[PDB]
Design a protein around this nucleic acid. Structure first.
Ligand SMILES: *[PH](O)(O)OCCCOc1cccc2c(OCCCOP(=O)(O)OCCCOc3cccc4c(O)cccc34)cccc12
Ligand SMILES: *C[C@@](*)(O)[C@H](CCCNC(N)=[NH2+])NC(=O)[C@@H]1CCCN1C(=O)[C@H](N)Cc1ccccc1
Ligand SMILES: [K+]
Ligand code: NA
Lengths: 251, 32
DNA sequence: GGTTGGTGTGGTTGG
Protein backbone atom coordinates (compact mmCIF):
# COMPACT_ATOMS: atom_id res chain seq x y z
CA UNK A 1 0.00 0.00 0.00
CA UNK A 2 1.47 3.33 -1.16
CA UNK A 3 0.67 6.62 0.63
CA UNK A 4 -1.63 4.86 3.10
CA UNK A 5 -1.47 4.65 6.88
CA UNK A 6 -1.25 2.03 9.63
CA UNK A 7 -4.56 0.26 10.24
CA UNK A 8 -6.15 0.34 13.69
CA UNK A 9 -6.51 -2.86 15.71
CA UNK A 10 -9.48 -4.80 14.36
CA UNK A 11 -10.09 -2.28 11.55
CA UNK A 12 -10.01 -5.06 8.96
CA UNK A 13 -10.79 -8.39 10.75
CA UNK A 14 -11.27 -10.28 7.47
CA UNK A 15 -7.73 -9.47 6.31
CA UNK A 16 -5.73 -12.65 5.71
CA UNK A 17 -2.04 -13.38 5.09
CA UNK A 18 -0.83 -16.00 2.63
CA UNK A 19 2.41 -17.25 4.16
CA UNK A 20 5.00 -19.42 2.42
CA UNK A 21 5.93 -22.46 4.50
CA UNK A 22 9.41 -22.98 3.01
CA UNK A 23 10.92 -20.51 3.22
CA UNK A 24 9.13 -18.03 5.50
CA UNK A 25 8.00 -15.23 3.16
CA UNK A 26 4.84 -13.10 2.93
CA UNK A 27 3.20 -13.96 -0.39
CA UNK A 28 -0.07 -12.10 -0.77
CA UNK A 29 -3.23 -10.82 0.86
CA UNK A 30 -6.64 -12.54 1.09
CA UNK A 31 -9.99 -12.19 2.85
CA UNK A 32 -12.05 -14.45 5.12
CA UNK A 33 -15.56 -14.90 3.70
CA UNK A 34 -16.76 -17.60 6.10
CA UNK A 35 -15.31 -19.71 8.91
CA UNK A 36 -13.99 -22.25 6.40
CA UNK A 37 -13.41 -20.29 3.19
CA UNK A 38 -10.86 -17.68 2.07
CA UNK A 39 -10.70 -15.57 -1.10
CA UNK A 40 -7.54 -14.40 -2.90
CA UNK A 41 -6.09 -13.39 -6.27
CA UNK A 42 -5.24 -16.41 -8.44
CA UNK A 43 -1.89 -14.98 -9.57
CA UNK A 44 -0.86 -15.52 -5.93
CA UNK A 45 -1.03 -19.28 -6.43
CA UNK A 46 -0.45 -19.86 -10.14
CA UNK A 47 1.72 -17.61 -12.28
CA UNK A 48 3.96 -19.73 -14.58
CA UNK A 49 5.94 -16.71 -15.95
CA UNK A 50 7.45 -16.26 -12.48
CA UNK A 51 7.60 -20.03 -11.94
CA UNK A 52 4.83 -19.99 -9.33
CA UNK A 53 2.69 -23.11 -8.94
CA UNK A 54 1.99 -23.55 -5.21
CA UNK A 55 -0.21 -26.20 -3.59
CA UNK A 56 -2.02 -26.80 -0.30
CA UNK A 57 1.09 -27.95 1.55
CA UNK A 58 3.32 -25.09 0.39
CA UNK A 59 1.19 -22.45 2.13
CA UNK A 60 -0.47 -21.80 5.41
CA UNK A 61 -2.86 -18.90 5.99
CA UNK A 62 -2.64 -16.43 8.89
CA UNK A 63 -5.74 -14.63 10.22
CA UNK A 64 -6.14 -11.75 12.70
CA UNK A 65 -2.67 -10.31 12.07
CA UNK A 66 -1.61 -6.66 12.37
CA UNK A 67 2.19 -6.68 12.73
CA UNK A 68 3.78 -7.88 9.48
CA UNK A 69 6.64 -9.96 10.91
CA UNK A 70 5.86 -10.87 14.54
CA UNK A 71 3.86 -13.92 15.52
CA UNK A 72 1.10 -12.04 17.40
CA UNK A 73 0.75 -14.48 20.34
CA UNK A 74 -2.89 -15.00 21.44
CA UNK A 75 -4.18 -12.91 18.53
CA UNK A 76 -3.51 -14.59 15.18
CA UNK A 77 -4.86 -18.01 14.19
CA UNK A 78 -2.91 -20.14 11.68
CA UNK A 79 -4.74 -22.51 9.33
CA UNK A 80 -3.73 -25.10 6.73
CA UNK A 81 -5.39 -25.52 3.33
CA UNK A 82 -7.60 -28.45 2.41
CA UNK A 83 -8.01 -27.48 -1.25
CA UNK A 84 -7.34 -24.70 -3.76
CA UNK A 85 -9.68 -23.73 -6.60
CA UNK A 86 -8.22 -21.44 -9.26
CA UNK A 87 -10.94 -20.11 -11.59
CA UNK A 88 -11.23 -22.36 -14.70
CA UNK A 89 -11.14 -19.54 -17.25
CA UNK A 90 -8.34 -17.67 -15.45
CA UNK A 91 -6.16 -16.17 -18.18
CA UNK A 92 -2.62 -15.83 -16.80
CA UNK A 93 -1.14 -15.65 -20.31
CA UNK A 94 -2.57 -12.28 -21.34
CA UNK A 95 -4.01 -9.86 -18.80
CA UNK A 96 -4.89 -11.78 -15.59
CA UNK A 97 -8.57 -11.86 -16.56
CA UNK A 98 -10.51 -13.71 -13.82
CA UNK A 99 -7.75 -13.29 -11.21
CA UNK A 100 -9.61 -15.07 -8.40
CA UNK A 101 -9.03 -18.14 -6.21
CA UNK A 102 -10.82 -19.84 -3.31
CA UNK A 103 -9.32 -21.93 -0.49
CA UNK A 104 -11.11 -24.25 1.92
CA UNK A 105 -9.50 -24.67 5.35
CA UNK A 106 -8.88 -28.04 7.01
CA UNK A 107 -10.53 -26.93 10.26
CA UNK A 108 -12.97 -23.97 10.73
CA UNK A 109 -11.46 -20.85 12.33
CA UNK A 110 -12.98 -19.37 15.49
CA UNK A 111 -14.07 -15.72 15.39
CA UNK A 112 -12.68 -13.06 17.74
CA UNK A 113 -12.23 -9.29 17.96
CA UNK A 114 -9.57 -9.63 15.27
CA UNK A 115 -11.08 -12.42 13.18
CA UNK A 116 -14.43 -11.77 11.51
CA UNK A 117 -15.70 -12.52 7.96
CA UNK A 118 -16.60 -9.90 5.33
CA UNK A 119 -19.77 -9.92 3.21
CA UNK A 120 -19.94 -10.59 -0.52
CA UNK A 121 -22.06 -8.08 -2.53
CA UNK A 122 -25.23 -8.87 -4.46
CA UNK A 123 -27.07 -7.56 -7.55
CA UNK A 124 -28.48 -4.52 -5.75
CA UNK A 125 -25.47 -3.77 -3.54
CA UNK A 126 -23.04 -3.94 -6.48
CA UNK A 127 -25.32 -1.67 -8.53
CA UNK A 128 -25.61 0.83 -5.66
CA UNK A 129 -22.02 1.03 -4.42
CA UNK A 130 -19.79 0.15 -7.39
CA UNK A 131 -19.87 3.47 -9.26
CA UNK A 132 -17.21 5.97 -10.32
CA UNK A 133 -16.04 8.52 -7.74
CA UNK A 134 -17.28 6.24 -4.93
CA UNK A 135 -14.36 5.41 -2.62
CA UNK A 136 -13.43 1.95 -1.34
CA UNK A 137 -10.79 0.70 1.09
CA UNK A 138 -7.64 -1.31 0.37
CA UNK A 139 -5.51 -3.05 3.00
CA UNK A 140 -2.26 -5.01 2.72
CA UNK A 141 1.31 -5.62 3.91
CA UNK A 142 2.80 -4.94 0.45
CA UNK A 143 5.56 -2.48 -0.50
CA UNK A 144 5.33 1.16 0.62
CA UNK A 145 6.96 2.34 -2.63
CA UNK A 146 7.35 1.25 -6.27
CA UNK A 147 10.03 -1.40 -6.87
CA UNK A 148 12.56 0.92 -8.47
CA UNK A 149 12.46 4.15 -6.43
CA UNK A 150 7.77 -2.81 3.33
CA UNK A 151 5.62 -1.69 6.33
CA UNK A 152 5.80 -2.79 9.97
CA UNK A 153 1.99 -3.08 10.36
CA UNK A 154 -1.03 -3.51 8.06
CA UNK A 155 -1.53 -0.56 5.73
CA UNK A 156 -4.87 0.99 4.84
CA UNK A 157 -5.73 3.48 2.07
CA UNK A 158 -9.03 4.81 0.70
CA UNK A 159 -9.26 4.87 -3.09
CA UNK A 160 -12.01 6.15 -5.48
CA UNK A 161 -13.34 3.94 -8.30
CA UNK A 162 -12.71 5.16 -11.87
CA UNK A 163 -14.91 5.00 -15.02
CA UNK A 164 -13.96 2.47 -17.73
CA UNK A 165 -13.28 5.22 -20.37
CA UNK A 166 -10.51 6.69 -18.19
CA UNK A 167 -9.72 3.17 -16.98
CA UNK A 168 -8.99 1.67 -20.42
CA UNK A 169 -7.12 4.63 -21.96
CA UNK A 170 -4.75 4.50 -18.97
CA UNK A 171 -3.11 1.20 -19.94
CA UNK A 172 -2.22 -0.78 -23.08
CA UNK A 173 -3.43 -3.99 -21.41
CA UNK A 174 -6.78 -5.36 -22.58
CA UNK A 175 -9.49 -4.82 -19.94
CA UNK A 176 -12.43 -7.14 -19.26
CA UNK A 177 -15.81 -6.85 -17.52
CA UNK A 178 -14.24 -8.74 -14.61
CA UNK A 179 -12.05 -5.76 -13.68
CA UNK A 180 -12.30 -2.20 -12.41
CA UNK A 181 -9.63 0.38 -11.60
CA UNK A 182 -9.40 2.82 -8.70
CA UNK A 183 -7.21 5.72 -7.61
CA UNK A 184 -6.83 9.49 -7.77
CA UNK A 185 -6.49 11.38 -11.05
CA UNK A 186 -3.27 13.46 -11.44
CA UNK A 187 -5.00 16.77 -10.68
CA UNK A 188 -7.06 15.45 -7.75
CA UNK A 189 -4.45 16.39 -5.14
CA UNK A 190 -4.74 13.28 -2.97
CA UNK A 191 -2.86 10.17 -4.14
CA UNK A 192 -2.20 6.55 -3.13
CA UNK A 193 -2.39 2.96 -4.40
CA UNK A 194 -1.92 -0.74 -3.72
CA UNK A 195 1.49 -2.17 -4.64
CA UNK A 196 3.44 -5.42 -5.01
CA UNK A 197 2.57 -7.92 -2.28
CA UNK A 198 -1.01 -6.64 -1.89
CA UNK A 199 -2.68 -9.09 -4.27
CA UNK A 200 -5.59 -11.03 -2.79
CA UNK A 201 -6.07 -8.13 -0.36
CA UNK A 202 -9.76 -7.04 -0.35
CA UNK A 203 -11.31 -3.85 -1.74
CA UNK A 204 -14.20 -3.14 0.61
CA UNK A 205 -16.99 -0.57 0.83
CA UNK A 206 -19.38 0.09 3.73
CA UNK A 207 -23.10 -0.14 2.93
CA UNK A 208 -24.81 3.05 4.24
CA UNK A 209 -28.06 1.08 4.46
CA UNK A 210 -27.05 -1.69 6.86
CA UNK A 211 -23.59 -0.49 7.94
CA UNK A 212 -22.13 -3.84 6.85
CA UNK A 213 -18.85 -4.06 4.91
CA UNK A 214 -18.81 -5.61 1.43
CA UNK A 215 -15.78 -6.88 -0.51
CA UNK A 216 -16.22 -5.42 -3.98
CA UNK A 217 -12.68 -6.01 -5.27
CA UNK A 218 -9.56 -8.16 -5.08
CA UNK A 219 -6.15 -6.54 -5.66
CA UNK A 220 -5.06 -7.93 -9.04
CA UNK A 221 -2.47 -5.92 -10.97
CA UNK A 222 -0.83 -2.55 -11.62
CA UNK A 223 1.86 -0.74 -13.61
CA UNK A 224 4.31 0.50 -11.03
CA UNK A 225 2.69 1.93 -7.89
CA UNK A 226 0.94 5.29 -7.49
CA UNK A 227 2.08 7.12 -10.62
CA UNK A 228 -0.01 9.83 -12.28
CA UNK A 229 -2.06 8.40 -15.15
CA UNK A 230 -1.87 4.87 -13.77
CA UNK A 231 -4.50 3.09 -11.68
CA UNK A 232 -4.54 -0.17 -9.71
CA UNK A 233 -6.84 -2.89 -11.07
CA UNK A 234 -9.15 -5.09 -9.02
CA UNK A 235 -10.99 -8.34 -9.64
CA UNK A 236 -14.73 -7.64 -9.86
CA UNK A 237 -15.96 -9.92 -7.06
CA UNK A 238 -19.68 -9.83 -7.89
CA UNK A 239 -19.34 -10.61 -11.60
CA UNK A 240 -17.64 -13.79 -10.38
CA UNK A 241 -20.00 -14.38 -7.44
CA UNK A 242 -21.89 -17.01 -9.45
CA UNK A 243 -18.64 -19.01 -9.55
CA UNK A 244 -18.02 -18.55 -5.82
CA UNK A 245 -21.37 -20.06 -4.76
CA UNK A 246 -20.89 -22.93 -7.22
CA UNK A 247 -17.57 -23.91 -5.62
CA UNK A 248 -18.81 -23.71 -2.00
CA UNK A 249 -22.01 -25.74 -2.41
CA UNK A 250 -20.34 -28.40 -4.56
CA UNK A 251 -17.50 -28.86 -2.06
CA UNK B 1 -25.52 -16.93 0.37
CA UNK B 2 -24.14 -14.33 2.81
CA UNK B 3 -22.99 -15.34 6.31
CA UNK B 4 -25.31 -14.49 9.21
CA UNK B 5 -23.25 -11.76 10.86
CA UNK B 6 -20.59 -10.85 8.27
CA UNK B 7 -19.18 -7.37 7.62
CA UNK B 8 -19.80 -6.14 11.18
CA UNK B 9 -16.57 -5.45 13.04
CA UNK B 10 -16.43 -6.48 16.75
CA UNK B 11 -14.36 -3.43 17.63
CA UNK B 12 -16.33 -0.92 15.56
CA UNK B 13 -19.89 -1.52 14.31
CA UNK B 14 -20.52 -3.90 17.21
CA UNK B 15 -19.70 -1.08 19.63
CA UNK B 16 -21.18 1.80 17.64
CA UNK B 17 -17.64 3.10 17.10
CA UNK B 18 -16.21 4.56 13.89
CA UNK B 19 -12.70 4.11 12.48
CA UNK B 20 -10.32 7.01 11.84
CA UNK B 21 -11.05 7.37 8.13
CA UNK B 22 -14.40 5.75 7.33
CA UNK B 23 -16.27 9.07 7.09
CA UNK B 24 -14.16 9.75 3.99
CA UNK B 25 -15.88 6.71 2.49
CA UNK B 26 -19.35 8.11 3.18
CA UNK B 27 -18.50 11.59 1.87
CA UNK B 28 -17.55 10.00 -1.46
CA UNK B 29 -21.13 8.68 -1.78
CA UNK B 30 -22.61 12.15 -1.36
CA UNK B 31 -20.47 14.75 -3.14
CA UNK B 32 -18.44 12.32 -5.27
C1' DG C 1 13.40 -15.30 22.74
C1' DG C 2 9.88 -17.51 21.23
C1' DT C 3 6.27 -20.08 15.66
C1' DT C 4 8.11 -12.94 17.12
C1' DG C 5 10.50 -6.44 17.88
C1' DG C 6 11.33 -3.42 20.85
C1' DT C 7 11.30 -2.09 25.19
C1' DG C 8 7.33 -3.53 30.75
C1' DT C 9 3.09 -1.45 36.06
C1' DG C 10 2.33 -3.94 28.08
C1' DG C 11 0.61 -4.18 23.72
C1' DT C 12 -4.09 -6.26 19.58
C1' DT C 13 -1.20 -11.25 24.22
C1' DG C 14 1.97 -14.41 29.03
C1' DG C 15 5.60 -14.66 31.17
P1 LIG D 1 7.03 -16.32 34.89
O1 LIG D 1 6.72 -15.18 35.85
O2 LIG D 1 7.04 -17.70 35.52
O3 LIG D 1 8.49 -16.01 34.27
C1 LIG D 1 8.73 -14.72 33.66
C2 LIG D 1 9.91 -14.07 34.33
C3 LIG D 1 11.06 -13.82 33.39
O4 LIG D 1 11.32 -12.41 33.29
C4 LIG D 1 12.02 -11.96 32.22
C5 LIG D 1 12.88 -12.72 31.48
C6 LIG D 1 13.56 -12.15 30.39
C7 LIG D 1 13.38 -10.84 30.05
C8 LIG D 1 12.48 -10.02 30.79
C9 LIG D 1 12.26 -8.65 30.47
O5 LIG D 1 12.96 -8.21 29.40
C10 LIG D 1 13.01 -6.80 29.16
C11 LIG D 1 14.26 -6.44 28.39
C12 LIG D 1 14.47 -4.95 28.24
O6 LIG D 1 14.77 -4.37 29.54
P2 LIG D 1 16.30 -4.15 29.99
O7 LIG D 1 17.20 -4.78 28.96
O8 LIG D 1 16.45 -2.69 30.32
O9 LIG D 1 16.42 -5.00 31.35
C13 LIG D 1 15.85 -4.47 32.58
C14 LIG D 1 16.95 -3.96 33.48
C15 LIG D 1 17.15 -4.80 34.72
O10 LIG D 1 17.66 -6.09 34.37
C16 LIG D 1 17.32 -7.16 35.12
C17 LIG D 1 16.36 -7.16 36.11
C18 LIG D 1 16.09 -8.34 36.82
C19 LIG D 1 16.75 -9.50 36.56
C20 LIG D 1 17.75 -9.54 35.54
C21 LIG D 1 18.48 -10.73 35.22
O11 LIG D 1 18.14 -11.81 35.96
C22 LIG D 1 19.43 -10.73 34.24
C23 LIG D 1 19.70 -9.55 33.52
C24 LIG D 1 19.03 -8.39 33.79
C25 LIG D 1 18.04 -8.35 34.81
C26 LIG D 1 11.39 -7.89 31.21
C27 LIG D 1 10.71 -8.46 32.30
C28 LIG D 1 10.90 -9.77 32.65
C29 LIG D 1 11.79 -10.59 31.90
C1 LIG E 1 0.37 -10.28 -7.27
C2 LIG E 1 0.16 -8.87 -6.69
O1 LIG E 1 1.00 -8.66 -5.55
C3 LIG E 1 0.42 -7.76 -7.69
C4 LIG E 1 -0.40 -6.53 -7.30
C5 LIG E 1 -0.20 -5.36 -8.25
C6 LIG E 1 -0.21 -4.03 -7.51
N1 LIG E 1 -0.07 -2.92 -8.43
C7 LIG E 1 -0.74 -1.77 -8.27
N2 LIG E 1 -0.06 -0.64 -8.15
N3 LIG E 1 -2.07 -1.75 -8.23
N4 LIG E 1 0.16 -8.19 -9.07
C8 LIG E 1 1.11 -8.28 -10.02
O2 LIG E 1 2.29 -8.01 -9.87
C9 LIG E 1 0.63 -8.73 -11.37
C10 LIG E 1 0.72 -10.25 -11.45
C11 LIG E 1 1.44 -10.59 -12.74
C12 LIG E 1 2.12 -9.31 -13.21
N5 LIG E 1 1.46 -8.23 -12.49
C13 LIG E 1 1.53 -6.91 -12.75
O3 LIG E 1 1.05 -6.08 -12.00
C14 LIG E 1 2.24 -6.45 -14.00
N6 LIG E 1 3.08 -5.30 -13.72
C15 LIG E 1 1.23 -6.08 -15.09
C16 LIG E 1 0.61 -7.28 -15.78
C17 LIG E 1 1.40 -8.23 -16.44
C18 LIG E 1 0.80 -9.32 -17.06
C19 LIG E 1 -0.59 -9.46 -17.05
C20 LIG E 1 -1.39 -8.50 -16.42
C21 LIG E 1 -0.78 -7.41 -15.78
K1 LIG F 1 7.15 -9.68 24.44
NA1 NA G 1 -2.36 6.79 -9.62
Amino acid sequence: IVEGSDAEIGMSPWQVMLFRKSPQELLCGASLISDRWVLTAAHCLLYPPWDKNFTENDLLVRIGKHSRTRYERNIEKISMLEKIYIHPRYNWRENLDRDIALMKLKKPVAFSDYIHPVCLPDRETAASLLQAGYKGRVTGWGNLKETWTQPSVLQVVNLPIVERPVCKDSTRIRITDNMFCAGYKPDEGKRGDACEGDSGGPFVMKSPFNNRWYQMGIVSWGEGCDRDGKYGFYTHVFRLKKWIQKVIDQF
Amino acid sequence: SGEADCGLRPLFEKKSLEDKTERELLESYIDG
